[PDB]
Amino acid sequence: GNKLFNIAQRILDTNSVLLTERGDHIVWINNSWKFNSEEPLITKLILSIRHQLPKEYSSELLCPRKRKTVEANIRDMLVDSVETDTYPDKLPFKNGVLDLVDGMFYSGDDAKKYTCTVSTGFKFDDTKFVEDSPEMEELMNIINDIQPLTDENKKNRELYEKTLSSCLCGATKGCLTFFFGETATGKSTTKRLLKSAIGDLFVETGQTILTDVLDKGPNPFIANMHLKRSVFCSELPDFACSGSKKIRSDNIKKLTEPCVIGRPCFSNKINNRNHATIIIDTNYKPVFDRIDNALMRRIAVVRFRTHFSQPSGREAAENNDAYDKVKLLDEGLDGKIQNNRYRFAFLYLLVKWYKKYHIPIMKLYPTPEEIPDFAFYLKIGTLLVSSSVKHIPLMTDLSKKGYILYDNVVTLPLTTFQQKISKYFNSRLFGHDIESFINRHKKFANVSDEYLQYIFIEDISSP
C-alpha cells in the first residue's frame, strides 16, 4: 500500500493521539497531554514525532499537504473514546507527573499512563525541590508568623494545614472553607503563595456564584471551574448594610456535588466536573437566608489573629481585641512572592502535609461552633426531645408540669412552651430566632387548640 497510510498506522500504534467523550482530540507532546478546540494539534504531533520513524518516512513529513493527508487518515482510523482524569493522587506538570503517595517524579511513558488533561503550567525541577534550602527557613519563619505554634492555636493550625494540603487532590470535596480575619492579617499572602505553588490549577471567580441563580442563561464563572483544584472568592460585602444580597443555601448545597450544572457562552454543554476546594476570604461573618441541618454540615472556618503594622500605628493595634500579636511588616515580601521565590519550598511543604492527613483517605469536616448564627439551633439539639411512646407511661409527672396527653402522645401547648424556652434564651437578642423556630413546628388541632410535640430533657429527669 501507499506509505502515507503506513505512516498513519505507525503513528496510531504508539497511542499518542486519543479521543475523549466530549469530542476533542488530545495529543501527547513534550511529555504532556495537550488539546485545543480550535487548532488541530495533530499536525504538530506529526511534525514532532518524525524522528522516531525510520529514515525513508521522515522526508515526506516536511510537506504540509502530506501532513494534512496523514491527519485525515488518523481521524478516519480513530473511532472510539476513552476517559480522562481518573487518578486523584497524581499531580501533573509540564514535563511529567508527580506521585503524591511516595514522592517520585515520573517522565515519559511512565507519565503517559495517567491521562491528565490539566497541568500546573511550569516544569518540575529536582534541584529546588529540597528541604534544606535557604528559602525554606525564611518561608517557615513567615508561616510561623502567620500561624503561631502555640497550644491555643494548635487546632486552628491543623485546619489551616489540612485545608491548604487538600488543594493537591483531584476528588470532590464536601465542605467549603471561610478565611476570617481583620485587615493586614496575611490572608492574601497565603492566597498568592498557593497561586505561585500550583500555577494553572488555581482560579478565582466572582461572588455571583453565591448569590445568583447558576443555571439561568450563560454563566462563564461556573464553566471556568471545570477540573480546577482550587477556587478562591474574596472580599464579601458587609451584610448589615441595606440592599445586600444574603448567601443562598441551595447554592452551597449545589457546589458540593460531583457535577455542577452550568453553561458558558455559545455552548450546549451543561455538565462540569467539580474537583476544586472552595475558599472564601472575608472580613465579616457570613449571613444566610435559611439555616438547616443540611447547611451546617458543609461549613468550616479558619481564624487569622496576627497583625502586620507600620511602626507609626503600632500603639493603636495593641489596643484591639481582634489581634493577638503585632509585628512589623516587610515591604519587599510581595515582590519576592511575585517572582516565585518560594514556589518549590511551599510545594514541598504541601506534599509533606499531604502525607500527614490524606494518605488513608481524603476527608474534610465541618466546624459549626464557629458561626454565631448557628448557636440557636445547636443548643436546641441539647434541650428538646421529640415525643415518643416511651414518654407516655411517666405522664404522671408531666401532667403536673403542664403537659397534655392528646391523641395518646405527650404534648405541650405553644403558649405553655414559649415562656419555658424564654427562660433559657435572651428574648431581646434572639427575638427573631424564637418566632422563627415556633412557626415551622406549630400543630393546631382546632381554632382554639394549640400544641407542640416536644419534651424538655430537664423535665424528663427524675427529681
Ligand X SMILES: Nc1ncnc2c1ncn2[C@@H]1O[C@H](COP(=O)(O)OP(=O)(O)OP(=O)(O)O)[C@@H](O)[C@H]1O
Ligand Y SMILES: Nc1ncnc2c1ncn2[C@@H]1O[C@H](COP(=O)(O)OP(=O)(O)O)[C@@H](O)[C@H]1O
What residues between 107 and 166 interact with ligand X by CB under 6 A? 142, 145-146
Half-sphere exposure of 111 (CA within 13 A, CB side): 24
Q: In angstroms, rounded to a whole number, what is the distance separating the alpha carbons of residues 40 and 44?
A: 8
Beta carbon nearer to ligand Y, 117 or 189 = 189
Amino acid at 135: E
Instruction: Count Cβ atoms below 10 Å from residue 435 Cβ, excluding itself.
Output: 10
Closest CA to 93 of 110, 72, 116: 116
Rule CB under 6 A: which of 256-315 touch ligand X? 294, 308
The CB-of-281 to ligand Y minimum distance in angstroms stands at 7
Among residues 82, 66, 79, which one has the least CA distance to residue 8? 66
* Closest approach of ligand X to the CB of residue 132, in Å: 21
Looking at the Cβ atoms of 13 and 331, the one nearer to ligand Y is 331
Q: What residues from 309 to 368 belong to the interface with its own copies (CB under 8 A)? A: 316, 319-321, 331-332, 335, 361, 363
Is residue 216 involved in binding its own copies (CB under 8 A)? yes
The residues in 206-245 that bind DNA, with binding defined as CB under 7 A, are 217-218
Q: Which residues contact 288 (CB under 8 A, 6 or more apart)?
A: 246, 247, 248, 249, 252, 295, 373
Residue 61 corresponds to which cell in the numbers above?
513529513
| Cβ nearer to DNA, comparing 13 with 266 | 266
- By the rule CB under 6 A, 187 interacts with ligand X: yes
CB nearer to ligand X: give 334 or 435. Answer: 334
Q: Which does 361 bind (CB under 5 to 8 A by kind): ligand X, its own copies, Mg ion, none?
A: its own copies
Q: How far apart are CA 70 and CA 78, in angstroms?
A: 12
Q: Who contacts 236 (Cβ-Cβ below 8 Å, separation ≥6)?
A: 207, 280, 282, 283, 284, 286
Contacts of 445 (CB under 8 A, 6+ apart): 406, 451
Candidates 67, 112, 157, 187; binder of Mg ion (CB under 5 A) is 187
- State the maximum Cα–Cα separation within the chain, in Å, rounded to a whole number: 103
Which region among 107-115, 128-136, 213-221, 399-407 touches its own copies (by CB under 8 A)? 213-221
Which helix (H) or strand (E) element contains residue 63?
Answer: none
The amino acid present at 205, given as its one-letter code, is T
* Residue 164 near ligand Y by CB under 6 A: no
CA–CA separation, 198 vs 121, rounded Å? 9
Judged by beta carbon, residue 305 or residue 358, the one nearer Mg ion is 305
- Judge whether 208 and 310 are in contact, CB under 8 Å: no
Tell me: does residue 270 bind its own copies (CB under 8 A).
Answer: yes
- Per CB under 6 A, the list member of 177, 185, 272, 367 interacting with ligand X is 185
Comparing CB distances to DNA, the nearer of 267 and 339 is 267
Footprint of its own copies on 48-67 (CB under 8 A):
48, 59, 62-64, 67
Site for DNA in 243-302 (CB under 7 A): 265-267
Q: How far is the CB of 348 from its own copies (least distance, A)?
A: 24
Choice between 40 and 264, CB closer to DNA: 264
Euclidean distance between the first and final Cα of the chain, in Å? 99
Binding site for ligand Y (CB under 6 A): 142, 145, 181, 183-189, 308, 327-331, 333-334
Binding site for ligand X (CB under 6 A): 142, 145-146, 181, 183-189, 294, 308, 329-330, 333-334
